[PDB]
Structure 1
């Protein structure tokens, strides 16, 4: 039942038959060996992913699929803050609405239409058996029903324990099963007492039952354009990524440039960082937040380039109240934060930590 649907999604996930030229599957870009992200080097390094055609690059970094099933459906809460959904800009309501978009996206899997997807599913006797036992006979002959069913299976697969095991060192320490090291505890303490927890914690107060280190909200943290990735994307140097404002139905100009707060689980192994993969190193990502707090000349400098960070892509709706905390992270606290964020790595990805 629920097991069968997930198992069907497991098949679909690693199947290149869902791309136009059968060169890529979900797993090509969301690689289980790299916490469901993309290990492949393209024109902009690992910042953006190459699609089915071997040429086309995206404009956004491929995020982990781990723990994405814990995100609530897109909505506007009582304070008028948008929460949840999927994609960096929340343009998809949930995992089901999300699944079909990569399939039909010409810069991604590049299937021309739902009819084409159905045709490919129809070619597989194991999919005829699998789908029909769950959705009824003839399901794969209807493009709309087949496409929706495939989206359903992938969403179910993403919701299994394998995508969200909660077996990181952090989870073990919270179960009283072991202890943080001195450096790790300092990092945790810095995290909960500094500005980080205002966005990278599920709740404002109290204890979350299944913490994923994101409040699912939308924020503009003032990142600059990723030059090489933007070039590779082919979108043009006049293009502006407006984040949440890009979602159909969002018209409020205050949402321009805001992106979904990522979950920090597995963060140590899913570099490069941010919506456009501009920063290769985790420490660099942490150090970016100093630019709003530190008065030292080095804080204006991206350590990866040795040049100023760059002006924000979108110079409005910046989360200045949260970002301008009045306290700079020294190197020791940066070390501490790195060490803490490393404890959010799933058990199976601990060998990747070197």
Structure 2
């Protein structure tokens, strides 16, 4: 039955009939050949994705669905912090609640309402058979039931081993099947002793059963606006992306500009980087953190542009206690971190590591 639910989800996931002009499935933006991210070029490069209508652009980068099923449902943790949920701003409580949204979003799949989704599902005899077997007779003739059911199937599909195989080099080493290279080992050591570990490890102490290199908390690391992406989204030059504060029920201005810590799994292959795709190269995302610790002139410069990084989109609520570590990564340690993070690439994407590396 769990099998059966996921297997239905698997069908929906690549079905373009869930988009208004039938051009677009979940898998168009979350492409399995690219660690469930969007390889397609748009007006802002690969920063933001283009919807079913062929011209609406989003304002955020399409994230991977790999390991998304390890993320807890939105809640407040034992230390009193918000944690978990789905979307870069956590506005969806969980995968089930997220899945319906791209379907109805006019900048994405653009179905006009739930009824229209139910009608598309009805048209397919396989869905009538598959859904009714799991949910009961007539599930597809009631729009809300059908919509909820489709969302559960997709959420189940995303919780299968396919999305979270734990077969990266890192997993192999931790299992004792092989060893890191010297450089990889140096990256591992640097990652766990430097500030990265305060945010990009599941646990504050002890060992995770299924590590996904994020604590699922929300942080403002003081990123600039991605000009070309913001342009393409049409939200307006004076728009401000408030992150977590956009979640309904969050009102506290202290949450403005904070985003969910992303799993670093497959990070080497899911460029460009950050919630707005502002940085093309992984090395650059690493270097960004030096702006808070290095004294030297070059730390203020984005090496992709040759100009200063830019002022934070949201200048308040920066995680300064964590970011201002008092230590700057030299080029050796940046190389080591790049080497370590490549070890977090799932086995099937290892050939993608080039891209000439």
CA distance in 1, matches of 2:7, 2:233: 34
Residue number in structure 2 paired with 1:124: 124
CA distance in 2, matches of 1:219, 1:184: 27
**Range with greater deviation from structure 2 (250-259 or 74-83):** 74-83
CA distance in 1, matches of 2:223, 2:106: 27
Per-residue CA distance 1:115-140 (angstroms, 9 max, x = gap): 00000000000100110111111100
Is the counterpart of residue 115 in structure 1 residue 115 in structure 2?
yes
Residue number in structure 1 paired with 2:211: 211
CA distance in 2, matches of 1:52, 1:43: 15
Per-residue CA distance 1:300-343 (angstroms, 9 max, x = gap): 00000000000000000000000000000000000000000000
CA distance in 1, matches of 2:230, 2:332: 34
Per-residue CA distance 1:46-101 (angstroms, 9 max, x = gap): 00000000000000000000000000000112322100000000000000000000
CA distance in 1, matches of 2:29, 2:91: 19
Per-residue CA distance 1:271-314 (angstroms, 9 max, x = gap): 00000000000000000000000001000000000000000000
CA distance in 2, matches of 1:11, 1:189: 42
Residue number in structure 1 paired with 2:268: 268
Q: Secondary structure at the match of 1:128?
A: helix
TM-score, with structure 2 as normaliser: 0.99
CA distance in 1, matches of 2:238, 2:330: 37
5+ residue gaps, structure 2, are none
Q: Secondary structure at the match of 1:47?
A: coil
For residue 238 of structure 1, report the CA deviation from its aligned partner.
Answer: 1.2
CA distance in 1, matches of 2:78, 2:237: 38
CA distance in 1, matches of 2:285, 2:80: 28
CA distance in 2, matches of 1:237, 1:42: 18
Q: Secondary structure at the match of 1:221?
A: coil
CA distance in 1, matches of 2:77, 2:66: 25
Runs of 4+ displaced beyond 4 Å = none
Q: Secondary structure at the match of 1:60?
A: coil
Aligned residues: 354
